[PDB]
Design goal:
Layout (H helix, E strand, L loop, with lengths): L1 H15 L3 H8 L10 H13 L3 H14 L4 H13 L3 H14 L4 H13 L3 H14 L4 H13 L3 H16 L3
Helix pairs in contact: 1-2, 1-3, 2-3, 3-4, 4-5, 5-6, 5-7, 6-7, 7-8, 8-9, 9-10
Subcellular location: Magnetosome membrane
Protein name: Magnetosome protein MamA
Organism: Magnetospirillum gryphiswaldense (strain DSM 6361 / JCM 21280 / NBRC 15271 / MSR-1)
Length: 174
Amino acid sequence: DIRQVYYRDKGISHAKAGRYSEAVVMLEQVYDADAFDVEVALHLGIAYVKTGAVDRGTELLERSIADAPDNIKVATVLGLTYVQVQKYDLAVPLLVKVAEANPVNFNVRFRLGVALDNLGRFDEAIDSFKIALGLRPNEGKVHRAIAYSYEQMGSHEEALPHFKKANELDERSA
């Protein structure tokens, strides 16, 4: 049975190390939908999404949240994954949940702002962006996002400073 142990232990290790193609090749052989292992599904799911099997990976991630609906780690990948695929609606609750549990995770907060902006919730997106800026004040992309949000509400007077600040911090990357 160490035949399966190789593929599962190793495949996860590939998945964690960004070696996504090799993670698919192995974990494909270990995942069993009727004998569910969350740590396998999670990584095989990440690795399907990375290698362009988005629908397949998404559903595997959805099944993993089902097996453990309060596991923050799966909620993070799932939440992030939905944003990439432009399933913004489905992203928000998960990202809100994760940001609450994980206040120092910048990308989660930033993508939650992104998901919100896309949903037309401009003022909500700006609130989230500002929380993200609080974590990483040197991050010019966030001042730009805030600026676009304002712009989409016609508040050009409020956008301009944020655009200027964005420009300056891309200078600060010298």
